[PDB]
Design a protein around this ligand. Structure first.
Ligand SMILES: Nc1ncnc2c1ncn2[C@@H]1O[C@H](COP(=O)(O)OP(=O)(O)OP(=O)(O)O)[C@@H](O)[C@H]1O
Ligand SMILES: Nc1ncnc2c1ncn2[C@@H]1O[C@H](COP(=O)(O)OP(=O)(O)OP(=O)(O)O)[C@@H](O)[C@H]1O
Ligand SMILES: Nc1ncnc2c1ncn2[C@@H]1O[C@H](COP(=O)(O)OP(=O)(O)OP(=O)(O)O)[C@@H](O)[C@H]1O
Ligand SMILES: O=c1[nH]cnc2c1ncn2[C@@H]1O[C@H](COP(=O)(O)O)[C@@H](O)[C@H]1O
Ligand SMILES: O=c1[nH]cnc2c1ncn2[C@@H]1O[C@H](COP(=O)(O)O)[C@@H](O)[C@H]1O
Ligand SMILES: O=c1[nH]cnc2c1ncn2[C@@H]1O[C@H](COP(=O)(O)O)[C@@H](O)[C@H]1O
Lengths: 461, 460, 460
């Protein structure tokens, strides 16, 4: 339960910008003595959930984040065949070794240059008949005819190791390698994946989020139109480890009905529903059958929902109120929206959320589905965009009529960090910060963070 | 500390949030104010230079101590470098400054680069330890940059025996083309320089000195490793004050470190930090600190706050911690976020006994970094943080732990084209604080904290 | 030279006015061309570095001579520095290069600055003459700039004994993370470094060497004072070639100086300049010069032309003077305005035996000036003129003569973010000139001038 400094009782509600954490007496010396695992049934080992947005939640993101202990929620209305293919891909991945970009010897240098940035490894693996035969780097593509063949620029010499080799050993094998990529082989010699020095280190820091079969975790979202029960059962059968019942205004009869319909199917999976920003909405969603309530409605005062409707709530106050209500009912809260810095993750957790959902921030990474773009200053970025009517309740004349008022798709430019270009660099950034918040507070884990935290309010100074 | 009636905000206060209400005053002159501190640091003005490699070099330590401040050498400075730095500072004259020196065989290019390590506007050419000429920036212009210093140096300059009264040196320089007097030892060797402004400052600032009359200096130590052994070595090297420094001072490892150092009975004032709470202040004092350094993420948009959400608005932090320390007979240093003389005055009004300044003083001639110039040819220097040297701590194992460590962030600190030296900043700071006391009716720093009335203002 | 029929313009020609027409060629490969010169300079490529303090330092002299050029030390360099420079250059290895070296106790800040004095991308850390590590620019990033080199140096690096076949060293570096081989003397002390590109260049460029197999170097003298005594001392210090240099070469004081030096019978090639006319070329050769340096105000907008109206378009100047020198068995150096490989090729087509290059080579790592960065953070260095060191020459009287002296003009020469080393410029120049020869059908430089057909183009 949060405590505020004496007298810090503002006549207004609080954003992540309004509050600070006061250090407390601590005997948690090292960041690594903190346990970042969550307690809400999601199965995450770090408190990061990737938002059910097409701009962010693709198969590369789902593999990469779950390996480091987060979970990705697939966007609602992804066709069920594509759900199954995505789940099968993620759940066939190695828990340590990553999936590289692969090239044919007959690919063009131009196509190789474009594909390289789909992963953060800095190299693609040339394969012939399933066997790795070389590496292609960005440097190998410079100053050559963009329609030359990959065969003519690929490097035949690279570090290789059998899949299952200790990450400690792979790390040392790469110490004096020119290219910081080890090509991992299956017993027959075919490609099993890659491991970089930083990937080797991360294996010893992050615990993979895994299902009961030991395969990487993945979640899936459903909107509240149509046959919500049938959609949810299909997602469960496709292999989702967690269902998110998602709508813009969660505190409404159609959402309550949808939760009861999914809960009555007894699918055996944690059920998230949202979004609300009130204790009353939180209670009603839990009593309908959800165990996790997703919290966040127009948290940004200048963002589209607030400027169209006036409707929203400052997110820190929303999470504090909803998490306390959920805690009294045996449930949990996900803080959804507005996260742009590790501070926001730490404050949402201090406020009592069990997990933090991140959307547009993660669009600005190699692993998000969108294409890598470059602005006027040649700086890298990717476009985030909203789910719009896929989060809303719903003749050719009649089609245009209902379509006239629906929300447009807003687009934002999310710059890639030249130093944190991969999502795993953001995860290092986020969890380094949260681990530090825990040491300042005196907390050895996330329950203790929320139990011990002291907060204050600051002015616009 | 007294606020205007009703000024009880539902939030904590930064330096930007508050103002001092003038009071009835009989303190007419700025110079009637006593700026000396009462915390055992020995400073005669309330300025301490932060233990940061970007700021706390030997030129800074000499220059600030002569004007009554003290410089804290950065933690993990190797002990031989500590001894060499202390021996340099403690061999400096109390009035006469150390100039840039040049060999006749140095190049004009090197002379030009070295001139800006001090604020004197002239380097002294020396031969066999004795002054033979002056080099100015104007002497370097329009000359082949690989010409020798001997071919641009001025052989005519004001000289006087070291020990000459600063008033008389001031007058000797009144009609000199170059505002630099070259001071000599009895054997003719260079003893230092004195400018007309340096001579005036000798009459305004009392040097901060040890019991032997030598310039004061302090040294910091982090809480990893053998803190007692490190502190004992710093004491034997001659530090006048020890600073036990860590990002999160309110933790067991810091309490243990204070007790270990205190048990060695080194005979020096012990500073420990950083905290921002009354409880943290009490705990550091009870472990053995006499002075508590206060400041944790005071800037809402700076790295610590944006990484962790952790911190506290610095005026409120200093108010609460100073009051806690004073009940126990201790003191607090206000550490962080100082950018204007107002911040120094407000820290003291809040009850701090001393104010620690870091990045602001990086933008001076005397800081250790190189003088740089931006797109508009304006001078600046980079300040950067101490990072993991303030944090608690196989090649795989090393890279594992190194992954999460705080990176070194850098900021550009512009030099004032009129306050380019740190002593100009000290003039600016102490002129302002003296005026704050005259407005409050205070004749010294205890009276400033006792008599001040403060108010809160809006974002207007 | 032959010009296309009717190409007889009513004006003189710059390097921008002319083009070379391809001829029937059986010179297939650029590597079949012999770029060695025939003027007694001993260069194996037609490049001479100008006698300018902005360019002609010891690192440049070593680096260019190893690739077959020669550097002319600036006039009025003190004879003790001449001797030190000559001794440095003539003790260099003909294949292995001199690296930047560092002490383990140097700062990261100093290491970063020194790295750019060579093009190797790495400095060698030395303790007691022995190499113990390599420092790269990447090693310096993200660490405290006052950390010690010891804490960032890489202890793993490729090493081979001096005398190892360059082709073997090239192979040894194929999978090395750092493209630098540390070459050792028999006792294991540092002898130098070799990179993969340095290994390749050893198979392309023949070092310019004296009869004892040591790298060649030249030295310049102005025409004031005791020219014969100065020339004698330069020869005694070991210069392989002397340059008698003045702004207006066609004058009595220059003729006297050439005769004075010629009469000493020093046994060295003797360059004198500068002139732009057939009459001046004949007079300098008759006075005793073997090589005439050609070039006076070749740029219509540069300082000499804008101050006096005096000069001559350089391509016409070279054509006229080279033809005149050939009638007397002499040679011509094309001095001034070279900015592209085209200019070198056109100078040689015009009949020059060698091409002297100044400010272009200031924008390299190996030039003596410091590496600078412009408003866009792009690397550059400043070239500047020798000014009154090329001119004929009470403190009142000194100021009277000084009032009219030429000021030093300064210009920014940007480094190529790739071709930052002077050897990269030599690759650019000699690749171009070799191509010119293949287009002309010439197997060597005399054939280039004998076979070339030129044309004139308009301003379009
Ligand atoms: N059939 C589909 N209908 C609608 N959206 C889809 C469909 N298939 C995939 N998507 C969406 O396209 C985006 C990219 O999905 P995914 O990463 O699975 O594609 P991919 O082509 O396999 O990826 P990659 O770019 O790595 O080749 C996601 O937003 C996903 O939800
Ligand atoms: N051996 C060392 N290891 C690490 N840091 C050092 C060492 N010696 C000095 N420093 C740091 O380098 C910076 C400059 O130190 P200092 O001014 O004493 O050096 P200096 O070279 O003698 O000075 P100057 O700038 O006048 O030439 C300071 O941050 C200091 O702490
Ligand atoms: N004593 C001197 N007087 C005048 N000019 C000099 C003197 N010594 C060197 N120079 C000039 O200084 C410049 C640099 O010379 P040189 O390269 O020999 O110096 P260095 O200090 O050994 O170089 P570096 O350390 O940068 O490699 C050249 O223009 C050279 O002519
Ligand atoms: O089109 C949209 N409009 C408004 N909110 C949206 C839209 N699409 C997604 N959202 C919400 O915004 C969250 C992501 O917020 P972000 O992390 O600040 O980008 C999602 O998890 C949804 O709750
Ligand atoms: O790397 C760092 N991160 C955060 N705080 C730092 C760092 N280095 C120094 N500090 C603190 O910042 C103070 C200086 O603050 P400044 O005067 O605002 O620059 C120091 O005295 C330390 O308390
Ligand atoms: O100060 C100067 N003014 C004019 N010409 C100069 C000066 N210094 C050197 N020079 C000449 O300019 C040549 C170099 O020309 P650059 O290669 O175009 O820079 C030298 O070799 C000299 O002939």
């Amino acid at each position: 339960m949060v405590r505020f400094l004496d007298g810090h009782t503002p006549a207004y509600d609080l954003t992540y910008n309004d509050v600070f954490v006061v250090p407390g007496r601590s005997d948690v010396a090292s960041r690594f003595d903190v346990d970042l695992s969550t307690v809400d049934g999601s199965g995450t080992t770090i408190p990061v959930v990737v938002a059910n947005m097409t701009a962010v939640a693709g198969r590369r993101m789902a593999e990469t984040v779950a390996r480091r202990g987060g979970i990705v929620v697939l966007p609602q209305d992804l066709p069920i065949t594509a759900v199954s293919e995505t789940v099968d891909f993620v759940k066939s991945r190695d828990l340590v070794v990553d999936t590289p970009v692969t090239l044919s010897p007959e690919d063009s240098v131009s196509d190789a240059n474009a594909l390289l940035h789909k992963r953060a490894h800095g190299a693609a693996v040339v394969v012939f008949e399933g066997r790795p035969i070389g590496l292609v780097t960005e440097a190998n593509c410079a100053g050559v005819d963009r329609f030359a063949r990959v065969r003519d620029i690929a490097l035949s010499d690279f570090v290789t190791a059998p899949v299952g080799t200790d990450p400690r050993e792979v790390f040392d094998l790469l110490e004096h390698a020119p290219i910081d990529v080890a090509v991992m082989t299956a017993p027959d010699g075919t490609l099993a994946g890659v491991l970089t020095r930083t990937g080797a280190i991360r294996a010893g820091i992050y615990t993979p989020a895994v299902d009961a079969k030991g395969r990487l975790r993945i979640a899936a979202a459903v909107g509240i139109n149509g046959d919500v029960g049938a959609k949810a059962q299909a997602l469960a059968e496709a292999g989702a480890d967690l269902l998110v019942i998602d709508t813009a205004h969660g505190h409404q009869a159609k959402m309550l009905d949808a939760i009861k319909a999914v809960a009555s199917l007894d699918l055996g999976l944690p059920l998230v529903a949202g979004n609300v920003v009130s204790a009353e909405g939180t209670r009603d969603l839990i009593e309908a059958g959800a165990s996790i309530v997703k919290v966040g409605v127009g948290p940004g005062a200048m963002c589209t929902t607030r400027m169209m409707t006036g409707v929203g709530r400052p997110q820190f106050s929303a999470v504090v109120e909803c998490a306390a209500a959920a805690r009294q009912l045996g449930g949990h809260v996900w803080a959804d929206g507005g996260v742009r810095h590790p501070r926001d993750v730490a404050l949402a957790l201090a406020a009592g959320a069990s997990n933090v959902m991140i959307g547009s921030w993660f669009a600005g990474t190699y692993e998000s589905p969108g294409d890598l773009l470059f602005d006027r200053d040649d700086r890298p970025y990717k476009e985030s965009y909203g789910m719009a009517s896929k989060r809303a309740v719903a003749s050719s004349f009649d089609r245009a009529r209902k379509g006239l008022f629906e929300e447009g798709i807003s687009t934002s430019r999310m710059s890639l960090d030249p130093a944190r270009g991969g999502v795993e660099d953001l995860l290092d950034h986020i969890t380094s910060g949260v681990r530090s918040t825990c040491t300042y507070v005196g907390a050895a884990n996330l329950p203790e963070l929320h139990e011990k935290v002291v907060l204050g309010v600051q002015s616009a100074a």
